[PDB]
Design a protein around this ligand. Structure first.
Ligand SMILES: Cc1ccc(S[C@H](CCCCSc2ccc(Cl)cc2)C(=O)O)cc1
Length: 134
């Protein structure tokens, strides 16, 4: 047993707050905000050795990343940014930093009760996205 066992599984979005304002802060355009904001993604997290895989499946886009903690990688996001990402574990929280065009956003993922809580921050603006087991 290991590092991220409590994150492993299949999760479904059950609530979102302030995601439009977060997307505006990130620079997402109108049409993508409207369509992406409707989505109710499935997030599938798995671990094989040191490699963590996070898939997001939705009517808008299917994305997948695989990574080793602390080791930077290339990521094309669902809103089509080309970013440099680093994911670390900090006190039981998965901390995902995305860098592009001199900008930065941080996505934190933690277990709280039976939920997996996703907090997305872009400057002063936070969005909170709550997932439960599928
Ligand atoms: C449609 C859809 C697909 C995937 C997600 S991942 C997100 C966390 C990661 C957020 C930062 S990357 C990003 C993704 C989409 C947009 Cl619009 C803007 C930024 C989460 O809900 O858990 C959200 C919405």
């Amino acid at each position: 047993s290991h590092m991220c066992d409590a994150f492993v599984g299949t999760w479904k979005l059950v609530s979102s707050e302030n995601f439009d304002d977060y997307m505006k802060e990130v620079g997402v355009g109108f049409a993508t905000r409207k369509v992406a904001g409707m989505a109710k993604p499935n997030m599938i997290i798995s671990v094989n050795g040191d490699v963590i895989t996070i898939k997001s499946e939705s009517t808008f886009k299917n994305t997948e990343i695989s990574f080793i903690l602390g080791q930077e990688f290339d990521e094309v996001t669902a809103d089509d940014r080309k970013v440099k990402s680093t994911i670390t574990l900090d006190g039981g929280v998965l901390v995902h930093v995305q860098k592009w065009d001199g900008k930065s956003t941080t996505i934190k993922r933690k277990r709280e009760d039976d939920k997996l809580v996703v907090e997305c921050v872009m400057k002063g603006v936070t969005s909170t996205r709550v997932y439960e087991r599928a």
